[PDB]
Amino acid sequence: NREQVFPTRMTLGLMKTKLKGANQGYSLLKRKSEALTKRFRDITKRIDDAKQKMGRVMQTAAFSLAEVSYATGENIGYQVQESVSTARFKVRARQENVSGVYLSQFESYIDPEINDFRLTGLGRGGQQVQRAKEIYSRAVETLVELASLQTAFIILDEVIKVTNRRVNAIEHVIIPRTENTIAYINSELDELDREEFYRLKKVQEKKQNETAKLDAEMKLKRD
Amino acid sequence: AEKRTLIAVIADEDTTTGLLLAGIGQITPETQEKNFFVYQEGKTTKEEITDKFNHFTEERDDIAILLINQHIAENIRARVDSFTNAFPAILEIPSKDHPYDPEKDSVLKRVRKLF
Amino acid sequence: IVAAVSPAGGDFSDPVTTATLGITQVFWGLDKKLAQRKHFPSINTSVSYSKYTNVLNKFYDSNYPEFPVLRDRMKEILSNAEELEQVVQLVGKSALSDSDKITLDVATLIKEDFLQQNGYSTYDAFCPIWKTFDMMRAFISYHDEAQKAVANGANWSKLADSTGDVKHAVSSSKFFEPSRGEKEVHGEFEKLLSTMQ
Amino acid sequence: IVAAVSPAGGDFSDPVTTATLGITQVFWGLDKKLAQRKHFPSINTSVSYSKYTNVLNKFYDSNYPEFPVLRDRMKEILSNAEELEQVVQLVGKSALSDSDKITLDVATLIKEDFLQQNGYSTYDAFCPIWKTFDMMRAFISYHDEAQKAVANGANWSKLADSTGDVKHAVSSSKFFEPSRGEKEVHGEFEKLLSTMQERFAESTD
Numbered sequence: 001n002r003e004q005v006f007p008t009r010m011t012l013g014l015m016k017t018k019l020k021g022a023n024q025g026y027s028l029l030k031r032k033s034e035a036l037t038k039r040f041r042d043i044t045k046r047i048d049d050a051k052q053k054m055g056r057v058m059q060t061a062a063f064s065l066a067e068v069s070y071a072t073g074e075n076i077g078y079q080v081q082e083s084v085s086t087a088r089f090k091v092r093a094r095q096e097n098v099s100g101v102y103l104s105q106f107e108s109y110i111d112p113e114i115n116d117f118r119l120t121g122l123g124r125g126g127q128q129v130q131r132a133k134e135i136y137s138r139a140v141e142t143l144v145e146l147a148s149l150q151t152a153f154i155i156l157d158e159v160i161k162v163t164n165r166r167v168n169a170i171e172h173v174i175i176p177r178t179e180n181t182i183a184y185i186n187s188e189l190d191e192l193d194r195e196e197f198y199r200l201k202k203v204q205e206k207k208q209n210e211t212a213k214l215d216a217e218m219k220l221k222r223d
Numbered sequence: 224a225e226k227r228t229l230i231a232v233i234a235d236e237d238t239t240t241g242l243l244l245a246g247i248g249q250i251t252p253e254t255q256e257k258n259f260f261v262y263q264e265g266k267t268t269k270e271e272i273t274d275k276f277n278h279f280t281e282e283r284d285d286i287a288i289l290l291i292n293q294h295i296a297e298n299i300r301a302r303v304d305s306f307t308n309a310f311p312a313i314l315e316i317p318s319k320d321h322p323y324d325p326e327k328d329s330v331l332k333r334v335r336k337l338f
Numbered sequence: 339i340v341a342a343v344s345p346a347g348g349d350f351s352d353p354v355t356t357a358t359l360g361i362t363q364v365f366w367g368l369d370k371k372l373a374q375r376k377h378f379p380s381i382n383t384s385v386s387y388s389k390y391t392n393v394l395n396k397f398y399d400s401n402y403p404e405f406p407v408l409r410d411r412m413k414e415i416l417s418n419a420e421e422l423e424q425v426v427q428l429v430g431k432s433a434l435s436d437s438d439k440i441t442l443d444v445a446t447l448i449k450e451d452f453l454q455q456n457g458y459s460t461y462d463a464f465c466p467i468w469k470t471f472d473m474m475r476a477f478i479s480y481h482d483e484a485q486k487a488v489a490n491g492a493n494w495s496k497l498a499d500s501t502g503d504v505k506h507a508v509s510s511s512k513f514f515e516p517s518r519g520e521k522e523v524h525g526e527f528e529k530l531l532s533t534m535q
Numbered sequence: 536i537v538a539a540v541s542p543a544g545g546d547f548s549d550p551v552t553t554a555t556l557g558i559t560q561v562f563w564g565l566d567k568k569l570a571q572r573k574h575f576p577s578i579n580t581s582v583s584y585s586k587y588t589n590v591l592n593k594f595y596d597s598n599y600p601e602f603p604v605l606r607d608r609m610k611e612i613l614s615n616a617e618e619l620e621q622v623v624q625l626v627g628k629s630a631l632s633d634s635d636k637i638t639l640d641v642a643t644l645i646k647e648d649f650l651q652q653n654g655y656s657t658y659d660a661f662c663p664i665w666k667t668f669d670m671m672r673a674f675i676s677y678h679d680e681a682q683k684a685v686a687n688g689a690n691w692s693k694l695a696d697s698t699g700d701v702k703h704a705v706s707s708s709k710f711f712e713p714s715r716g717e718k719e720v721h722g723e724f725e726k727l728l729s730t731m732q733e734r735f736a737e738s739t740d
Contacts, residue, residue, distance in 0.1 A: 005548035010349040025428040044334055051331050055323030058316045061241040080243050087249035091228045091287050100433040104224050136245035143314065147288055151312035165626060188548060
């Protein structure tokens with residue numbers, strides 16, 4: 001372990017306080033790891049549920065696209081790609097405190113400056129296509145939220161691991177090091193006090209012997 | 224992270240059309256680059272897929288979410304599993320003629336283990 | 339009788355301090371943490387205490403509160419801020435509440451606007467009883483108002499970006515040319531407090 | 536004057552250690568860590584120091600060896616690898632970079648192939664000045680070549696993939712032979728740098 005040769009007594013207090021405090025910090029990191037584990041677990045079940053949602057959503061979007069294609073006849077991809085410029089639908093990163101952990105969440109943003117799609121030469125069926133677009137708008141957007149829940153879950157795992165690592169360091173590492181430091185310092189200090197006490201005992205014995213010599217001198221004077 | 228507000232997509236015809244229809248597509252006028260690219264299983268080479276993946280994941284500071292067809296994601300499952308960063312978030316979704324396999328998703332596979 | 343022991347390194351193991359502890363009627367501690375950090379004159383938060391505080395309060399009964407009875411309140415604020423910062427050091431700026439942010443900023447303010455006194459500076463050379471009571475009252479006002487505002491549904495960030503003058507004004511409330519201009523500073527401070535809303 | 540002090544439990548707090556360290560211009564410390572593991576001679580890189588090292592560098596410059604440079608570089612590599620050990624023991628081995636990992640690997644190489652020499656061996660029992668100087672020089676050359684190769688955009692592990700030959704060669708410099716064949720060692724170092732060039736050629740591609 002770790003031993004320091006030169007110790008006072010104040011150093012023992014600083015090490016003891018740092019040890020108890022790191023112990024409490026270990027407890028805090030442990031409970032935090034428990035809560036983060038539960039949260040990441042719920043986020044995991046929600047992530048699988050979100051994937052199984054995602055497949056159905058993809059099927060639905062594909063179906064909507066097919067319906068629009070049947071309605072239009074027209075070549076959707078050309079006009080669509082041509083009408084892309086700036087995002088009407090963007091995203092916004094936000095910071096949310098969640099059970100202690102600060103997480104980045106995504107918020108859907110709808111630019112009102114950008115208009116909706118207006119297909120020309122499609123007429124009434126174009127409106128049907130609009131509805132199909134709505135479906136996609138309703139769908140993948142929620143999926144993006146779920147995606148956030150995924151990313152935040154992943155990080156929630158990584159950070160949880162970090163907490164666990166701290167627990168690993170605050171267990172057999174920091175605690176044992178502080179214990180060895182406190183023990184060695186205690187031994188050095190108690191031994192030094194024992195040596196000083198020996199010097200004092202020898203001094204008191206010297207005074208007692210000198211006093212006994214005084215007494216012997218007094219007896220000699222009396223005789 | 225805060226700079227990440229745009230969505231990039233790599234997926235088949237139907238998916239690309241639907242997503243672009245939703246209004247998620249955007250073209251940077253200055254760079255003339257797009258945030259959408261139609262993909263074909265037969266025609267698009269694996270090297271271009273890996274290139275696009277690496278570029279969208281690391282070369283751009285403005286990418287928030289990368290969409291990818293399950294059929295497409297399977298071809299680069301290695302690179303997908305290799306991606307461990309929280310951003311961009313990884314979500315495997317189905318495509319036409321190619322339903323969504325849960326175990327195929329690299330991230331979701333990673334989550335599956337140790338469940 | 340004013341006595342000063344010279345403990346080595348700032349250790350409480352000082353035999354001088356150890357023998358002087360069971361006698362002296364008043365003990366003002368000097369924290370080694372605050373002294374070596376190049377901070378204004380050191381005072382231990384929890385250790386410093388006075389047994390004559392009750393009699394001094396009885397003598398302050400004629401001179402009234404602010405901050406005779408507000409000393410127990412400021413002690414509550416500083417002690418609770420110590421118990422809060424003790425965790426905050428082991429937590430960080432990541433996970434905290436609004437009352438906690440108000441408490442930390444309150445600790446920083448109580449540090450900058452109250453305890454700090456510069457003997458070398460001509461303006462900060464000394465402060466009046468009424469002047470220090472004025473700065474302490476200003477702090478207790480901004481703090482109680484922040485705590486009240488937190489219960490009104492107001493956030494920390496917007497409130498912090500709202501008033502940048504109130505801090506600089508609450509911090510300079512230590513005389514600096516006492517005692518004639520006291521009531522006027524009390525008026526400008528109270529006017530700012532009422533203008534905050 | 537060579538005097539052995541036997542403090543109780545190897546503590547520097549013992550009167551012997553202090554009184555000895557006080558009047559000494561040089562001190563070589565003995566550790567019980569590698570001695571308990573039946574490893575070779577144990578000396579603390581964080582403890583043992585000498586005040587006569589300067590004039591010793593001036594004297595080693597007579598042979599036009601670099602004592603001070605190699606010693607300071609190896610000591611810095613040792614300290615940085617020790618801090619890297621504290622960090623790896625703190626967080627993990629996956630929390631470091633390629634350069635720090637190269638420093639740790641170089642630390643291990645310096646531990647196994649340099650500081651540790653078997654006294655019961657028919658080779659490592661006695662190490663000549665030219666042998667240790669050539670060893671430290673070849674080590675520094677391999678370290679500089681690896682550091683330069685890592686700056687070329689190659690991973691430390693990928694660099695360590697084809698470098699096994701140079702590694703086994705660096706670890707085989709302990710045996711060697713009598714005074715004859717120093718040229719074979721220096722030449723082997725040249726072959727090591729050349730091997731590094733070959734690896735560079737291999738990378739591209």
